[PDB]
Amino acid sequence: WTATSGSCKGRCFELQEVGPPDCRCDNLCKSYSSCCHDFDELCLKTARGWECTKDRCGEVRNEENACHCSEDCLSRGDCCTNYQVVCKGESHWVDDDCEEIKVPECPAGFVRPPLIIFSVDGFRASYMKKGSKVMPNIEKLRSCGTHAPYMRPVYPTKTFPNLYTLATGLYPESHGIVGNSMYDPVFDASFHLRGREKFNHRWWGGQPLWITATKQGVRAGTFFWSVSIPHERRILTILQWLSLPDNERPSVYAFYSEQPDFSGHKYGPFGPEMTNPLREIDKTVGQLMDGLKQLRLHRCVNVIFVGDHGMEDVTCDRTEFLSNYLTNVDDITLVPGTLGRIRAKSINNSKYDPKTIIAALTCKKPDQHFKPYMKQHLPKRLHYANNRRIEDIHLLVDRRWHVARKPLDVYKKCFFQGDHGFDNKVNSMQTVFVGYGPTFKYRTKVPPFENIELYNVMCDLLGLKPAPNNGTHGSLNHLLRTNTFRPTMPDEVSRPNYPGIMYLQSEFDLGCTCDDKVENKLEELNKRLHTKGSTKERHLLYGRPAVLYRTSYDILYHTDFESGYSEIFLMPLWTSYTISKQAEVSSIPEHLTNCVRPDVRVSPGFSQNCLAYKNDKQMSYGFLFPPYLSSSPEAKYDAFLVTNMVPMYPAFKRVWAYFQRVLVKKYASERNGVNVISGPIFDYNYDGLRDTEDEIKQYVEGSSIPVPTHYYSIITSCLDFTQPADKCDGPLSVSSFILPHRPDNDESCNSSEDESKWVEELMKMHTARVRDIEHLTGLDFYRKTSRSYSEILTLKTYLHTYESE
Ligand SMILES: *[C@@H]1O[C@H](CO)[C@@H](O[C@@H]2O[C@H](CO)[C@@H](O[C@@H]3O[C@H](CO[C@H]4O[C@H](CO)[C@@H](O)[C@H](O[C@H]5O[C@H](CO)[C@@H](O)[C@H](O)[C@@H]5O[C@H]5O[C@H](CO)[C@@H](O)[C@H](O)[C@@H]5O)[C@@H]4O)[C@@H](O)[C@H](O[C@H]4O[C@H](CO)[C@@H](O)[C@H](O)[C@@H]4O[C@H]4O[C@H](CO)[C@@H](O)[C@H](O)[C@@H]4O)[C@@H]3O)[C@H](O)[C@H]2NC(C)=O)[C@H](O)[C@H]1NC(C)=O
Numbered sequence: 102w103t104a105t106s107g108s109c110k111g112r113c114f115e116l117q118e119v120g121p122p123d124c125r126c127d128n129l130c131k132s133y134s135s136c137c138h139d140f141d142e143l144c145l146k147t148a149r150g151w152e153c154t155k156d157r158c159g160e161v162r163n164e165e166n167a168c169h170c171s172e173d174c175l176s177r178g179d180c181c182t183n184y185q186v187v188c189k190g191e192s193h194w195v196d197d198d199c200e201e202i203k204v205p206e207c208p209a210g211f212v213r214p215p216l217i218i219f220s221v222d223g224f225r226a227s228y229m230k231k232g233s234k235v236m237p238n239i240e241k242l243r244s245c246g247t248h249a250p251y252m253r254p255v256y257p258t259k260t261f262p263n264l265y266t267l268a269t270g271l272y273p274e275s276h277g278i279v280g281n282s283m284y285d286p287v288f289d290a291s292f293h294l295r296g297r298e299k300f301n302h303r304w305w306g307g308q309p310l311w312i313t314a315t316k317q318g319v320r321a322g323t324f325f326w327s328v329s330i331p332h333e334r335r336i337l338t339i340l341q342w343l344s345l346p347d348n349e350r351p352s353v354y355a356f357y358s359e360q361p362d363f364s365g366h367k368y369g370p371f372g373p374e375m376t377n378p379l380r381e382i383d384k385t386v387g388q389l390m391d392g393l394k395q396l397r398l399h400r401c402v403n404v405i406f407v408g409d410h411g412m413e414d415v416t417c418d419r420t421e422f423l424s425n426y427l428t429n430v431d432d433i434t435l436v437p438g439t440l441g442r443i444r445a446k447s448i449n450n451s452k453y454d455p456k457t458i459i460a461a462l463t464c465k466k467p468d469q470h471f472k473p474y475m476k477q478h479l480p481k482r483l484h485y486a487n488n489r490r491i492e493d494i495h496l497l498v499d500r501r502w503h504v505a506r507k508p509l510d511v512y513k514k515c516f517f518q519g520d521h522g523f524d525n526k527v528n529s530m531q532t533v534f535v536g537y538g539p540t541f542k543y544r545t546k547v548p549p550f551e552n553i554e555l556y557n558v559m560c561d562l563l564g565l566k567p568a569p570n571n572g573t574h575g576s577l578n579h580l581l582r583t584n585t586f587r588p589t590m591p592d593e594v595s596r597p598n599y600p601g602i603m604y605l606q607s608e609f610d611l612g613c614t615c616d617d618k619v620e621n622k623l624e625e626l627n628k629r630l631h632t633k634g635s636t637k638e639r640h641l642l643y644g645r646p647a648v649l650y651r652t653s654y655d656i657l658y659h660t661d662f663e664s665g666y667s668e669i670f671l672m673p674l675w676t677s678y679t680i681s682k683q684a685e686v687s688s689i690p691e692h693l694t695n696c697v698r699p700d701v702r703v704s705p706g707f708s709q710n711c712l713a714y715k716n717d718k719q720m721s722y723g724f725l726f727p728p729y730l731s732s733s734p735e736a737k738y739d740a741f742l743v744t745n746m747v748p749m750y751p752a753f754k755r756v757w758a759y760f761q762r763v764l765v766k767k768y769a770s771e772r773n774g775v776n777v778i779s780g781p782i783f784d785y786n787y788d789g790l791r792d793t794e795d796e797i798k799q800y801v802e803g804s805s806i807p808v809p810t811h812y813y814s815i816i817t818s819c820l821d822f823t824q825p826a827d828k829c830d831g832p833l834s835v836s837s838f839i840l841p842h843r844p845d846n847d848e849s850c851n852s853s854e855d856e857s858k859w860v861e862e863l864m865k866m867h868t869a870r871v872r873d874i875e876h877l878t879g880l881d882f883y884r885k886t887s888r889s890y891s892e893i894l895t896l897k898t899y900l901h902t903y904e905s906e
Pocket residue numbers: 271272274275276277303304305306307484487488489569570571788789790876
């Protein structure tokens with residue numbers, strides 16, 4: 102109930118929300134159906150429109166007008182935005198040459214440069230170039246400020262998850278807004294774009310920027326705008342708030358536009374109808390900037406122009422229907438569209454079985470345009486599993502397609518030509534970032550980056566301490582002139598043991614065999630030196646990774662590779678090796694096919710055994726340092742040490758062997774050598790974080806050998822590929838992966854073919870950031886380079902996406 106009898110006189114767009122039943126005058130009152138009776142009259146004036154004209158200049162103030170052109174308007178803070186242009190001979194901001202903003206030029210009483218976030222829904226990255234001719238204000242922001250060629254959204258590439266990620270620095274699985282539509286089984290409550298349940302605070306986790314600000318003494322504008330408030334009024338409101346007394350005036354503001362998304366759904370991303378929405382947005386930017394210039398704030402305020410996600414061509418005819426795959430389609434609930442999420446229609450149906458649903462949706466039609474996953478099997482880069490609002494069964498939909506339950510769902514709702522939501526590496530989903538102001542750099546292009554990083558930067562811009570988030574603070578320091586955040590590397594928690602030869606061969610009863618009994622002071626000293634670390638400089642190029650948790654592990658050195666061997670998990674945490682451009686691939690010799698050798702530096706008690714693999718009919722093994730890339734026949738024996746062995750399902754060995762035998766040499770050839778760090782990952786609870794020993798759900802049968810959920814590799818070389826990876830003077834180049842350790846290749850519909858036709862495609866799907874691997878392992882890489890730490894942080898957040906431009 103609302104007592105709409107109260108009044109908005111002197112309260113229009115008040116910043117403090119009043120409580121029911123008292124009536125509201127804030128920028129969301131329309132959305133709650135709670136505005137006072139005179140809100141439209143007082144707060145949504147439209148008379149005479151939004152622009153001064155020559156005949157209005159110096160007029161007698163009429164308080165009815167939407168904006169003013171009277172002499173007093175500048176002191177009142179309520180001129181139309183083009184007042185000084187029309188009435189005082191000034192230029193539009195867009196017509197002024199850009200001039201570097203080396204220091205804030207702020208009026209007296211300003212404690213810090215304000216931040217204005219100008220957010221645009223559905224603004225596809227390529228609009229910045231494709232639309233540049235009709236967007237002059239935006240193009241001036243872009244060219245004169247700091248810009249990225251694109252900014253990567255979060256998955257799913259929907260509006261609410263992305264805007265809340267921008268605001269919090271959190272993945273959707275952590276902030277809780279995992280879709281525009283959601284069911285929470287604990288609450289037994291549904292969230293929708295339309296309706297009142299979304300207003301309940303229990304949905305919204307983490308701490309958004311406006312709360313972070315307020316908690317730390319920095320006043321914020323209200324970020325949200327009811328749809329019926331025209332854009333011109335949103336801009337005038339912001340400019341009026343900026344004219345508040347010092348003690349009342351906010352330091353951070355947002356503008357939101359529902360365009361170009363609204364038209365893009367109707368017309369497709371490049372429909373000829375899209376030019377006009379782009380022009381209108383540019384006009385709005387121009388109003389803001391002219392308005393700021395009038396207030397002498399255009400060289401004081403930091404402006405961020407940012408989007409939530411892009412827009413793809415999608416039409417009704419490109420719809421897959423689950424009714425063409427499932428016998429039982431009435432027994433499921435589907436969240437449909439550009440992603441699918443499936444759960445049981447009834448929790449009382451004991452015949453519901455996810456395994457049967459997954460199998461019925463797997464590789465059934467030759468051109469099938471979606472792929473089913475249990476959520477824990479989704480690419481780790483999506484960070485889309487650790488929330489009870491995310492259904493166990495997920496459908497990843499191909500770009501340009503939809504999934505629906507039945508045909509009647511699609512003609513009882515054609516119309517639309519655009520949509521979004523797909524995998525966040527898809528080029529059409531990419532969006533925009535421009536920063537302009539005293540704190541941003543001048544005429545600077547920065548590489549693409551993820552929207553999860555911006556919360557930290559916005560905090561930097563306002564002098565706030567960020568709440569805990571998924572950004573990597575410092576990785577965006579290169580966007581900033583000042584206010585950089587200078588982190589220190591984390592302290593190493595566990596120091597390594599460096600074992601020597603401590604065990605005789607006969608102390609081992611592992612059930613392993615090897616034909617290695619064939620035998621010199623020249624060369625014996627030389628191999629002892631290899632075991633003491635004499636080649637380590639060649640193979641450990643960026644220092645040893647640091648272990649950031651308490652554990653017991655050994656550094657093991659070899660001619661061709663170095664490893665950090667966990668006594669607790671009975672395998673390496675990491676294995677590091679360098680392959681030059683000139684390296685040769687060789688075979689596993691016949692006489693070594695089933696060779697596994699005890700490691701006399703490591704106790705039988707802290708070793709794997711071959712008998713467990715013999716007895717586990719489902720599980721085989723592979724090697725972290727590949728025997729195919731040994732430097733010599735004698736060095737190859739090291740690759741068959743029990744301390745280099747890891748548990749691998751036969752189906753996965755197909756993938757791993759092809760990576761090791763073919764792809765590593767290919768990358769070394771293409772990149773002028775590579776350094777490879779490979780290892781296991783354990784994430785049985787799919788939280789993106791390293792499992793403890795007591796979280797492990799599967800072991801090699803009858804043993805204490807844990808089974809990894811994933812295998813990673815980090816592949817590093819010189820950005821300047823004219824220098825070899827082992828003699829690189831400058832910036833680095835990286836690509837990495839986190840491959841799911843699955844007992845089948847059902848993910849890959851073409852896996853019956855030669856690995857040349859499917860393995861690399863699998864690997865591209867499971868591309869990762871070094872930072873993702875850090876979270877999953879508790880390791881900290883690149884500790885010893887010649888590079889700036891912030892540069893290394895940028896490198897750790899890089900994602901190799903495999904998309905063209
Ligand atoms: C991305 O960045 C984020 C932010 O840094 C990372 O998320 C953090 O990860 C930590 C570990 O997973 C986690 O720490 C836990 O906090 C628990 C207290 O949590 C509440 O308070 C905080 C602070 O205000 C708040 O932020 C939390 O918010 C979550 O929950 C609400 C719902 O109430 C949601 O609205 C909100 O969206 C958010 O949900 C998300 O996180 C939760 C987990 O907290 C998930 O379950 C959701 O799916 C969703 O992803 C909370 O309101 C604290 O109780 C935990 O302590 C247990 O574990 C420690 C281990 O040190 C153990 O010693 C303790 O004994 C304790 O165990 C006991 O409880 C167990 C479970 O009931 C039980 O099994 C035991 O037997 C014990 O009784 C823990 O410290 C931190 O909360 C989140 N924060 C956020 C914002 O998500 C994220 O990891 C990063 N991602 C990556 C990939 O790097």
